[PDB]
DNA sequence: GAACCTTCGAGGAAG
DNA sequence: CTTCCTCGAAGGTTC
């Protein structure tokens, strides 16, 4: 799941989130198996 | 009907209200979302309230935000992900959005999906985000500052207009029902005429007349009380303030109509240049009473006949 | 005290004073808060004084700040969070607030709520009923969306000689100085229609009466003091008289340009246009013309020159 | 897609289309990159579409960006460094980028190399970099406002021009078939005339007319239906929009035809003076309705008769 | 010392000196601070000198600063916070303060308090800072540059006027005693009449004459040495400089007295329009040698008899 | 490359080359740099190329920049520090440089030193930078565009003028010989006559004609081929461009032949005044199409007959 | 070296040297610093040169800076802190300093102190910096831009004057010795008459003639070589350029000597209105070739004979 | 009616 | 975001 975990942080940072908060935001997702799309969607959906 | 729900209840704006009805009905005839709409017009005409009415007619929810509230692409993408199929997103002051976000909105409006590129270019990958069908409703007072690519994506243009006497009169009559006061139809017309065509101004006058009627009268706004109330407040039958009359009278009495410089005119009425150019002068031009020329301000023949002075070319 | 505390003590401003009395009584009758009031106009007419009177009449404690003291949105939010039901907030020199602050004031005045980003998160605060009072000399500098939200607009106007005479007599009792009725009128004529100027002249005349007289202002001591100050019976200064005298004697009344006039009297161009000339125009002694400014017949009569059309 | 992909498909622009074909095939005969090309003209005439065609005709990857989208030299340097031999770079609004960015463009166009300043303060040096063979394609809206030293670097100029009625009718027919709508040649002709010679405008009106025909009519775009729809949309029989009618009507009714200054006019109608002068006046002037005069704008006799007002 | 310290030593300015005596004496009897005073007028007439005299006569310490030094509200707040009861604060070139900083003095001068934000974050509060009784003194040459609400708060105004020959003669004699110089009364009057009415100019001339008197003379200033020294400086008995004489001579000889335009005259003398208008023309007009008319500059009869020409 | 490298290759400009030859040869006998040279005249005459020739003749490196590209003194100092002994600095459009930067060159050009403030805060200090010997070459349209203090420091003035048909013909033949192409004298002369007297225009036209002759012809340029190729392009039978055609058409059809103000004309043609002033008007005047009068520009009978209007 | 180092070498400006010598010698006897001095006048007359001479004659080190280098008040304060007792500070182009900084010199020049704000920003107080005895030297081309209170503080004013033929001739000879060239007395006088009374122009002309004489001559400048070099330079025997000759000719040929309005003349000469009035006309009026009149400028008899036409 | 001179007013760009 | 200033217009006089 290193691809989805890293891809989420990589794309989330490209969207303007700070690397620190972007890493925490993705790390906060409980399911590790969540796909890149689900991680990015959940991270953004959970931040608003 | 102060806060309408459907076009059946919305007062005024008949042109835009009639056009939007056809496009919504044609959209409903298909399993499709309404095209992106851009609303134009001066401030305070009711643009925000109109967006809510559109959502009800379409039968979808409305998400409200503003351009200044959007600071990074993540904000817009997060907002969009919260929308459901057909939901409407209303962005006020769309002309103030940061360019860094504008370039992202194009793909969402055109493809309903966003592709983000990551990597060193020597090695890179993309992430595809699919968005539910949505309708964007933009509201802006200034159009020229909108970039051509963004304006090209909007497919429906709606123009707001100042309310006419019959429509503005009804707003006063119905607003008078929120309060416990009774207002005669003839008195409501006098306030509407002086409301400069803006609902917020008509509400302000009604509130002031109410205080007078319940203190200097029997708590009823009749023609007699309205005439007195509109006399304590030095508001002309054309809506000109006491200072507005002083400007025109000074130009006619001392300068024979002009040309006269702003500096000279300001010191005569003992006002600041900024005050005369921003508070009083704008409405006088819309009524056609004065014109701006390279040599200075000049009073038109329409001002002469209104103030009651002889005019000669 | 110098500043009147109630409408029974506040002299003049009939138009503004009469309107405010109606609105305050009506608001009390309904147990509601007064609408947002904006006071504007020339300096020294009583804008700040009226703001305190409004609070004393409503019977509420007045919160006070100023535009220059507020520098960031965080400042205004902290102040607004201190308001209690019915509190009145007075912001003097409101035209100095930054644009980023005025945008926050719209929601508070119209929606009674503020949205604060504060681990980053949004907190929504609900404000109780409150009345904002603003005062400024240049209302045109405020944003157009802000002016539209003020429900009461008070435009201050100059005072008449009978009112200024009553003000001079009132101030004389605070200083425990005896002044005759006709002596008070001599100062009122020279006060240029401004209460602050009337007080300034009284203070200066008092100093003379205490050093050169018996400590009493009378029809005789006033003429001596006014001659030492060199203020004409129309309120013209030594430089004001020199301007009219030069225009009539050297240029036959004009038209004469501002530059030429300034150099001849040995004055800075800015000072003539912004300090001395404004009062001469409003009183009708000078007129601005496309070719220059000219001295009117009123100037010839006052200075004692044979008018030649 | 709606936009054409090859010269055989691109409608109109016979002059520009014929010129480019010769130069494109000539370059292939020599097996070298095409010269720097500049496109200019009114917006929405297909300048971007033409760029995609040129790239397809050349068989080269098209990379797109814009003047305002470039903020610092490092941005343009990164873009140029990622160009493969023969690549085509298309930059819209090339006339609006910052002057500091154009410095890099001059050397890139004149000799395919750039010089980058390095260091700060007491340190001040530079590094020379050479660019591989490539072709620049620029697009502008006011060739008269482009930097003179830059304009002289372009070797090919393409003057885009308004489409004629025989061409716009073909575009409406083409678009109507994609939507599977039924439109008669007479109705398509009315839409073309009132489209102000712009393909983008013709598409906007065609979409809106479709919604009207599907409710007020039987789904067939007849002339009687097309005219009723265009009047509902407030589009004059000459293409003057709602704002255009407001301008001309105001001059005749409030200023007796002028002269009136832009400031007064732009304050009477609630519009920014800059918007009136930049977006609306150009069409009214080209049609001869408004004539700029020392004392202000004046309504010509053509505007009086068109609006139905008796001329003086 | 060069600058007078008390009204006994301050020569001239009768109108201002007489008024300040009454206001200072009256303030002492009531045991209260003097009202706020504004001093303005032409350069070098004694504005700064009077500010120090007021403090000595009141018998209090003087705190000094200048407009150009106060660039932000924090600077002014720190100065006011250091005021003690009865202190006098003098601000020279007060017109340079930024407008946003002047608005802080409004409440300080009338009510002796200022409002300051204190605390941190959501806990911040605005609080009144209360100031003890103090007097603000301002000196400026551009009084018209101050805001109307600020000038209205000054309770005392002093407009400086030029000095007359008897006073300037006494000033030259006094300054001559500061140095080890002996000057005959006849020679002292000779310098006063040429000093254009300004004490600083009278002092400047004395220094230049002294240097000559001790290098090309026996170290004593007499009518003989004064004539030779002033001849080298080329200062006319009316104070006209060399260039000032060149102007009047050209107008009388080439234009017959005028009228002549400033531009034309500037070229003939090889000067420039701005130097003639700002340095030379002002004194020539104020003293009556030149008259400005709609047609141009004209030389008066006074200039003819001074230069030695027949007033035909 | 095409660009000439030595005076043996630079055709024309005899009056300029002859002077530069003398000053350069003399400056080489003495171990010192050449005096600062100012080149001025119409754009595209080859003044930038001349800067390269001087550098090659002197045997030193040439650094290039432009007036509008330098925004603050710090930018210019960074460039001057980067110069090596004897290096040549070329500044295009020097008249357009900001005044804040121009006043820094005064000391650098006359004494080779610059006074600058270095450091920050407590470290701020003044340093007297000493520059090595260098030669500045400036370019401008007219000498009257530069301030007197700057113009006085340039020791050599080079006034450039339009090329004559014999010289342009040789340039076309030279250019056409660098490429593997063949051109007959009649075509070369015809192409030169159409080049509006500017070499930069001649080269661009030759490039397009080469592409046409390879696709639409036998690969050899002949009068008949050049006529057709030039007819396919917008170049008229006497060098008038489409912009030139638009100017005359607007002047005659709207203003009735003038007189018309250049500003009012510019805004109607939608072109910047600088372009008409520096590009179109000079040629139209020197070729007798436009006559300059106190009232404004007036179209001549030659223009009337060229466009085909009735010259009453 | 080119710049004269002492009064013994400084040719001309007798009126200024005679005064400066007395003031410097007087200051040395008293063992004091020289009073603040201002040097002003037309461009290139020797203002900067005299500033270095004053320092050398005083026998003290010179600190140098310039007006445009002082961007903010913090820079000037840092410079003033570096002064040592007796130091001379020279500010070239003093008129370029911003008003906000110029007002800081007022106190420093008259009372040798400066008010400054010091502290942590949160807490701060005003303090007096005490300056040692120093001399300020300023040079400006247009003193009119300096504020009246600043000019009044300069105790010594030096107005530079144009040089005469006898003085300007010696400058040419002196410069030739530095170049090791031999110049005949007749040739030295020829160059002087064409130098427009300005030393910088005389040195520029001499350098161009020197380069010519050693490239196509025996390395000697004689009355015969001067004519050839001056012909190549195209400088008439009166110092007129080709533009100046074109003007005078036009007035006589097309207007019979005038009166003619500048607008009319400008059109015939193809020159910009203000360029004629500000660049070329000033010299022609001072030499007597043109005379401004109420009805326009007229060409005098001197212009007729010089141009060779017959006067009437 | 061409040519000079003085004066005011609204832009616009350099702080 | 603001002050400074310069560009354009026109009234008045004279030959
Ligand atoms: N059609 C309308 N019917 C009733 N009230 C209206 C209408 N339009 C405007 N108003 C009143 O005026 C205000 C201004 O309209 P609104 O939509 O809020 O615009 P904005 O958001 O710019 O203030 C409304 O809040 C309401 O009080
Ligand atoms: N010749 C044409 N044929 C078909 N469609 C065209 C043509 N010209 C323009 N269009 C249509 O109008 C739009 C043109 O967009 P674009 O090429 O970006 O114009 P511009 O670059 O001028 O903004 C597209 O939607 C395209 O399909
Ligand atoms: N005398 C000449 N001989 C050969 N080529 C020339 C000559 N003059 C100019 N050119 C060519 O024409 C173009 C001139 O461009 P450039 O020197 O940059 O003109 P400018 O400096 O005026 O912009 C170059 O391609 C140059 O090689
Ligand atoms: Mg107040
Ligand atoms: Mg002082
Ligand atoms: Mg110098």
| Inter-axis angle of helices C14-29 and B223-232, nearest 10 | 130
Beta bridge partners of C155: C40
DSSP state string for B267-296: HHHT--HHHIIIIIHHHHHHTTSEEEETTE
Are the C-beta atoms of E109 and E119 separated by less than 8 Å?
Answer: no
Out of E22, E143, E144, name the one closest to residue C207 (CB): E22
CB proximity B296–strand H (7 Å threshold) = yes
Q: How far is CA C154 from CA B242, B276, C57, D58, E49, in A?
A: 12, 16, 17, 73, 45
Rounded-to-integer distance, Cα A7 and Cα A13, Å: 10
E103: left (phi over 0), alpha (psi -120 to 50) or beta: alpha
Contact D216 B22 (CB under 8 A): yes
**Closest ligand relative to E67 C-alpha:** 5
Interatomic distance F71 CA / H13 C1' (Å):
15
F41 lines ligand 3 (CB under 6 A): no
Structurally, chain A folds into a number of domains equal to: 1
Name the domain boundary from B128, B162, B196: B162
> Residue D243 sits in which domain range?
239-312
Number of domains in chain E: 3
- Shortest Cα distance, chain E CAs vs residue G143, angstroms: 7
* Tokens (6 digits) for F56: 């090659």
Residue F146 and residue F152: Cα distance in Å, rounded?
Answer: 10
Distance CA B94, CA F158 (A): 55
Closest protein residue to H15 (Cα–C1') = G98
Token pair, residue B59, equals 């039968």
Strand partners, F135: F88
Cβ-defined contact of B22 to D204 (cutoff 8 Å): no
Structural contact between residues D138 and D93, judged by C-beta atoms closer than 8 angstroms = no
| Residues G61 and G204 grouped into a single domain | no
The pairing of beta strand F290-293 with beta strand F296-299: antiparallel
- Please report which residue ranges of chain G form alpha helices under DSSP H: 14-30, 47-58, 73-81, 99-111, 148-151, 165-178, 185-194, 199-215, 223-233, 242-255, 262-269, 273-275, 281-286, 301-307
- The minimum CA-CA distance between F125 and chain G, rounded to whole Å, is 7
CA separation for the pair C258, C281 (Å, rounded) = 14
Residue range(s) defining the domain that contains residue A44: 1-48
Co-location of C21 and C145 in the same domain: yes
For residue D45 and ligand 2, the question of a CB distance below 6 A is answered with yes
B293 CB neighbours strand I below 7 A: no
CA distance C272 to C52: 36
Helices (H), chain E: 14-29, 47-58, 73-80, 99-111, 148-151, 165-178, 185-192, 199-215, 223-233, 242-254, 262-268, 273-275, 281-286, 301-307
Residue D225 and residue D287 share a domain: no
- F239 pocket-lining for ligand 3 (C-beta < 6 Å): no
Nearest to D233 by CA among D189, D192, D194: D194
Do B150 and B186 reside in the same domain of the chain? no
Q: Based on the domain organization, do E168 and E254 belong to the same domain?
A: no
Of A47, A48, A2, A8, nearest in space to A26 by CA? A8
Q: Which of C288, C255, C299 is nearest to E292 (CA)?
A: C255
User: Nearest CB to D99: which of F68, F78, F200?
Assistant: F68
Q: Is D139 helix (H, G, I), strand (E, B) or coil?
A: strand
How many Å apart are CA F174 and CA D26, to the nearest integer? Answer: 22
Could you tell me if D13 and D30 lie in one domain?
yes
Pocket, ligand 1, Cβ cutoff 6 A: B 2, 10-12, 43-44, 46-49, 171, 199-200
Round to whole Å and give the CA distance between F114 and F81: 10
Q: Is D41 in the pocket of ligand 2 (CB under 6 A)?
A: no
Whether residues G131 and G258 fall in one domain? no
Ligand 3 site, residue F46, Cβ cutoff 6 A: yes
Instruction: Name the residue with the least CA to C1' distance from nucleotide H8.
Output: C290
Closest residue by Cα to residue D138 from D89, D200, D171? D89
Q: What is the 3-state secondary structure (H, E, C) of G122-187?
A: CCEEEEEEECCCCEEEEEECCHHHCCHHHHCCCCEEEECCCCCHHHHHHHHHHHHHHCCCCECHHH
List bases in chain H with any atom under 7 Å of a protein Cβ. Answer: 2-11, 14-15
Coil/strand/helix, residue A18: coil
- Residues of F belonging to the active site: 47-48, 92, 141, 200
Backbone angles phi, psi at E188, to 5 degrees: -60, -45
Residues with CB under 5 A from ligand 5 (ion): E 48
Ion ligand 4: residues, Cβ under 5 Å: C 48
* Dist. CA D303–CA D289, nearest whole Å: 5
What is the number of other CB atoms lying within 10 angstroms of the CB of residue B293? 17
> Considering B180, B212, B238, which residue would you say is the last residue of a domain?
B238
Q: Write the residue with the smallest CA distance to atom 8 of ligand 2.
A: D46
**Residue G299 three-state SS:** strand
CA–CA separation, D117 and D106 (whole Å): 15
Alpha carbon of G236 to ligand 2 centroid (Å): 64
Exactly one of G48, G182, G264, G300 is catalytic; name it. G48
Report d(CA D92, CA D80) in Å as an integer: 15
User: In the structure, how far is the CA atom of residue G176 from the C1' atom of nucleotide H5, in angstroms?
Assistant: 49
CA–CA distance, F222 with F306 (Å, rounded to integer): 26
Pairing state between β D37-40 and E290-293 = unpaired
Which ligand is nearest to the Cα of residue B147, counting in written order? Answer: 2
Q: Please give residues of chain G from 254 to 283 whose alpha-adjacent beta carbon (CB) lies under 7 Å from any atom of strand H.
A: 259-264
Q: How far is CA G5 from CA C279, E64, G49, G54, in A?
A: 60, 44, 8, 9
* CA end-to-end span of chain E: 53
Distance D69 CA to H15 C1' (A): 28
**Beta-carbon count within 10 A of G23 CB:** 20
- What six digits make up the tokens of D166? 């025989």
Residue whose pair of structure tokens reads 């306030």 in the numeric block: B191
Same domain, F14 and F152: yes
Q: Is E246 exposed, middle or buried (0-12, 13-18, 19+ CB in 10 A)?
A: middle
Same structural domain, F99 and F210: no
Same domain, D286 and D194: no
Nucleotide nearest the Cα atom of C255 (by C1')? H7
Find which of C79, C96, C194, C204 to mutate to test the E interface (most E CBs within 10 Å of its CB). Answer: C204
Which residues are registered as beta bridge partners of D65?
Answer: D91
Give strand letter and number of the nucleotide nearest G262 (CA to C1'). H3
C269 and C259 Cβ atoms separated by less than 8 Å: yes
Cβ atoms within 10 Å, residue F86: 18
> Count of H helices and E strands in chain A?
3, 0
Indicate which ligand has the atom closest to the C-alpha of F160: 3
Calculate the alpha carbon distances from C207 to C201, C266, D83, D131 in Å. Answer: 10, 31, 87, 86
Touching status, chains F and E (3+ beta-carbon pairs under 8 Å): no
Q: Quick one: which atom of ligand 3 is closest to the CA of F44?
A: 22
Those residues with Cβ within 8 angstroms of residue C100's Cβ, 6 or more apart along the chain or in another chain: C72, C73
Q: How far apart are CA D223 and CA D288, in angstroms?
A: 28
Told to judge if D169 belongs to the known catalytic residues of this protein, a careful annotator would answer no
User: Around G87, how many Cα atoms within 13 Å sit in the side-chain half-sphere?
Assistant: 14
Q: Are residues E206 and E266 in the same domain?
A: no
This entry's atomic model was obtained through: cryo-EM
Give D135's contacts (C-beta < 8 A, 6+ positions apart): D33, D34, D35, D36, D37, D58, D60, D86, D87, D88, D89
Torsion of CA B140, B143, B148, B150, to 10 degrees: 10
| Spatial distance between the Cα atoms of D262 and F312, rounded to a whole number of angstroms | 36
Q: Nearest nucleotide to C289 by CA–C1' distance? A: H8
G174, G175, G177, G178: CA torsion to nearest 10 = 130
**Last residue in a domain, options E238, E258, E275:** E238
Q: How far is CA B24 from CA B19, B135, G33, in A?
A: 9, 12, 90
Please check whether residues F131 and F121 belong to one and the same domain.
yes
Contact F147, F140 (CB under 8 A): no
* Residue D46 in contact with ligand 2 by CB distance below 6 A: yes
Which residues lie below 8 Å from residue B184, measured CB to CB, with a gap of 6+? B221, B222, B223, B226
The two three-digit tokens of residue G103, written as one number: 């007002």
For helices D185-193 and D165-178, angle between their N-to-C axes, nearest 10 degrees:
120
Which residues touch D42 (CB under 8 Å, ≥6 apart)?
D141, D160, D162, D198
Physical contact, D and G (3 or more Cβ pairs within 8 A): no
State CA F247 to chain mean position distance: 23
Tokens 């030669």 locate to F135
Residue C48 falls in the annotated catalytic set? yes
The CA distance from B154 to B137, in Å, is 9
CA B279 / C1′ H13 distance in Å: 27
Give the separation between CA C99 and CA D90, rounded to whole angstroms: 39
Please indicate whether, in this complex, the C-beta atoms of F69 and D99 are within 8 angstroms of each other: yes
G265 and G251 Cβ atoms separated by less than 8 Å = yes
Q: Active-site residue D200, yes or no?
A: yes
Residue G9 sits at φ, ψ, to 5 deg, of: -95, -25
Q: What is the DSSP letter of B60?
A: -
C82/C80 Cα distance (integer angstroms): 5
Contacts of G121 (CB under 8 A, 6+ apart): E74
- What is the gyration radius of the CA atoms in chain A, in angstroms? 9
Q: Is C224 exposed, middle or buried (0-12, 13-18, 19+ CB in 10 A)?
A: middle
């Amino acid at each position: 799941s290193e691809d989805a975990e890293q891809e989420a942080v990589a794309a989330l940072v490209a969207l303007g989130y700070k690397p620190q908060e972007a890493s925490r935001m993705v790390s906060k997702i409980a399911r590790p198996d969540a796909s890149s799309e689900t991680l990015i969607r959940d991270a953004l959906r959970a931040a608003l | 009907t102060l806060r309408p729900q459907y076009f059946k209840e919305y007062i005024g704006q008949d042109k835009v209200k009639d056009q939007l009805k056809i496009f919504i009905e044609a959209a409903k005839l298909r399993d499709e979302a309404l095209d992106h709409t851009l609303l134009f017009g001066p401030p305070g005409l009711g643009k925000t309230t109109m967006a809510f009415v559109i959502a009800n007619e379409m039968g979808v929810n409305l998400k409200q935000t503003s351009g200044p509230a959007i600071e990074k692409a993540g904000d817009l993408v997060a907002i969009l992900n919260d929308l459901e199929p057909g939901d409407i997103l209303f962005i006020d002051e769309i002309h103030r959005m940061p360019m860094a976000v504008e370039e992202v909105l194009y793909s969402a409006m055109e493809d309903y999906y966003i592709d983000i590129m990551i990597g060193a270019g020597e090695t890179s990958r993309s992430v595809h985000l699919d968005l539910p069908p949505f309708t964007l409703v933009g509201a802006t007072t200034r159009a020229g500052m909108l970039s051509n690519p963004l304006r090209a994506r909007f497919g429906i243009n709606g123009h707001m207009e100042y309310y006419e006497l019959p429509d503005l009169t009804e707003i006063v009559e119905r607003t008078s029902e929120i309060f416990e006061m009774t207002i005669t139809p003839e008195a409501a017309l006098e306030l509407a005429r002086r409301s400069r065509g803006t609902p917020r101004i008509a509400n302000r006058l009604l509130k002031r007349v109410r205080d007078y009627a319940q203190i200097m009268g029997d708590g009823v706004i009749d023609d007699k009380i309205a005439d007195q109330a509109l006399t304590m407040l030095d508001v002309d039958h054309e809506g000109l303030d006491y200072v507005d009359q002083k400007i025109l009278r000074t130009m006619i009495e001392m300068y024979g109509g002009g040309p006269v410089g702003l500096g000279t005119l300001s010191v005569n009425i003992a006002e600041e240049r900024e005050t005369v150019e921003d508070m009083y002068e704008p409405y006088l031009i819309q009524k056609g009473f004065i014109m701006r020329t390279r040599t200075g301000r000049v009073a038109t023949a329409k001002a002469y006949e209104h103030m009651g002075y002889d005019y000669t070319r």
